[PDB]
Amino acid sequence: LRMKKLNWQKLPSNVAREHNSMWASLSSPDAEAVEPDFSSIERLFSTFLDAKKSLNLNIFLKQFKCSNEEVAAMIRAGDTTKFDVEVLKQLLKLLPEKHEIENLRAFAKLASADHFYLLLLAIPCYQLRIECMLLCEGAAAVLDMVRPKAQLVLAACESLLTSRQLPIFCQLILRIGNFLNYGSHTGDADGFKISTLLKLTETKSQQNRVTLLHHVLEEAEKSHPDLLQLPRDLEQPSQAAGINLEIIRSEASSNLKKLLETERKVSASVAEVQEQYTERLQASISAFRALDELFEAIEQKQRELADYLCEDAQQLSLEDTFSTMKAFRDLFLRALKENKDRKEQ
């Protein structure tokens, strides 16, 4: 009736009978044949979609814990109670294909995976419906995060423009630098780039532990209001470091371009879509206007700042100032602790 199956690496029937093979001799009465106990051996050992798309659809429908009929009503009604930003992206990829619609149209007996597609097909302009709330919810999470970045960079530029210690500090090093480099190619220069302050610690003294920044801080320690109120004014530019304005500007424009493109598609739809989603799209359109308007103010503010430092345009690309200034402030704090430690010990 049934025997336990032992697995062996079967050799081909044309190779195992070759002369070099040892099995050739066994196939002929050339060896002492032995017969096992045959009496005891028997009594002792006795859908239309592809798998890629169909399975991925069921997995997508198994995070809701509802029937396929119920989930179709939510898409038709545009409800977003259980639909999030990431969930919509997976649904956008999982859409009927050219061959899938033809097979369904040519057609319970069909599996539950295609059952949702049939219900989804009955929904008018299902492609447009998913894109409508994807942009609105995404735009809500974009404006509230770009805006603090826009205010932070604008505030940093104004504080940097209105700073009092930098004109005092940049003059002291310039006066000192002329003395240090007298009689050479360097020195006697009217000014220098903002990157100069980042190399102040490279000038070591005889002790090899006190740098040029340490020495100018030692004489600045006598006058606490002078050269020591600077880090208080550098807090805002320091936080602005690492936040480039090119990505945030492109993101606002890219979302607006997609939102404007879908606005025409929504307007071409039935009046039911207009009365409860059209006003949502235009609300986000008007909200972004204040966001890009503030960007022009930042561009105007940084244009003065670009000419404030007397540096060539396209070279002072905003983020360069933020990174250099934060590092300069970071080095300033470290020198203060060392100077204080030197005074006490």
């Binding site: 199956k5 697995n7 169909s54 399975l55 991925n56 997995i59 198994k62």
Partner: protein, 370 residues
């Protein structure tokens, strides 16, 4: 009829029935045996104790793991664990009861055939399927495309998945798991005096790491914090009633995952492993794969780990690139949850090896029909 799902791990065995949410029976995967002399004769004695029975009596037993680094080493010991799970924990006859199994990524070819013969012959299971730990892990997170950081007890893995199939060319592997993490804690625990040099005393030091150890965002800041003040100190009570205190050793045990030079390994941290495993894929996919980092396994259940690596990956990734670390609360049993979902699908019954199908092709049939 119902279909059983059995997950075989290096540290724990999670089994049960398909369609539920949590494993019915989760117990450590150990098979202990006595190392002493049985003076009494009245009581019932057994050659070996399997599961949590061995853990309870671990004071007089030596504990041996049938699975090391994901691969099944002691094949006769793992036949006891499956028998214990099917007949003692779940108490359901494996006959007329199709089962499902989860296999580690890059599983050796020989192991897959060995399991098929074990269940089909000894247990007489009418139907059986074999899946992958990383594939089922992404199913339980409500996704189909992403990269899974399956860091269990035996081996840490990074398996990028695309539309339900793993990418074998981009699958990484790091031998920095929970078992290696608790063995490093014992070495540094002697710096204060306490000594644990027994396998039964490894379970005691396992619970100290599980409860008290966490991850620091800045290693230097926490290093200076412990030296400046003793606010980091915590007290733990041993089973015998002694009290032990650990300070800076709390955050230095899980930090080895990000600075593997502490334990002597010359590889890179888990943060760099995901970055390296992401450059082996297509450029267009990298945008999609970067925002789908999905945690899994028990070894990633540390305070401030889903945030520490996001800070690290930010440095390695470009500024324009976006990072989205996904850390579901139930990530300890994610692998089983996906298997329960997969076995309950109506269309999944076509991927089952029928008993009559096995009567034509032997254990080699597992590679087909899969």
């Amino acid at each position: 009829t119902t279909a059983l799902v059995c997950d075989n791990g290096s540290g724990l065995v999670k089994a049960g029935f398909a369609g539920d949410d949590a494993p019915r029976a989760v117990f450590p995967s150990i098979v202990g045996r006595p190392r002493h002399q049985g003076v009494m004769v009245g009581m019932g004695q057994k050659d070996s104790y399997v599961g949590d029975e061995a853990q309870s009596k671990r004071g007089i037993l030596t504990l041996k793991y049938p699975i090391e680094h994901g691969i099944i080493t002691n094949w006769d010991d793992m036949e006891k664990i499956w028998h214990h799970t099917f007949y003692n924990e779940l108490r359901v006859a494996p006959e007329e009861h199709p089962t499902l199994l989860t296999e580690a990524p890059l599983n050796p070819k020989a192991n897959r055939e060995k399991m098929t013969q074990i269940m089909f012959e000894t247990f007489n299971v009418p139907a059986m399927y074999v899946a992958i730990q990383a594939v089922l892990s992404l199913y339980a997170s409500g996704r189909t495309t992403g990269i899974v950081l399956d860091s269990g007890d035996g081996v840490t893995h990074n398996v990028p998945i695309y539309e339900g199939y793993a990418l074998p060319h981009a699958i990484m592997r790091l031998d920095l798991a929970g078992r290696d993490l608790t063995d490093y804690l014992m070495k540094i625990l002697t710096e204060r005096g306490y000594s644990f040099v027994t396998t039964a005393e490894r379970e005691i030091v396992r619970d100290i790491k599980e409860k008290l150890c966490y991850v620091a965002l800045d290693f230097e800041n926490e290093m200076a914090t412990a030296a400046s003040s003793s606010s980091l100190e915590k007290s733990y009570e041993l089973p015998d009633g002694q009290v032990i205190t650990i300070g800076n050793e709390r955050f230095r045990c899980p930090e080895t995952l990000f600075q593997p030079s502490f334990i002597g390994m010359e590889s890179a941290g888990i943060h760099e492993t995901t970055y390296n495993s992401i450059m082996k894929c297509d450029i267009d996919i990298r945008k999609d794969l970067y925002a789908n980092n999905v945690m899994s396994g028990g070894t990633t259940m540390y305070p401030g780990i889903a945030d520490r690596m996001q800070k690290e990956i930010t440095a390695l990734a470009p500024s324009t690139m976006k990072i989205k670390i996904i850390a579901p609360p139930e990530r300890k049993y994610s692998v089983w949850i996906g298997g329960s979902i997969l076995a309950s699908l109506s269309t999944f019954q076509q991927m089952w090896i029928t008993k009559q199908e096995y009567d034509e092709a032997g254990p080699s049939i597992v590679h087909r029909k899969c």
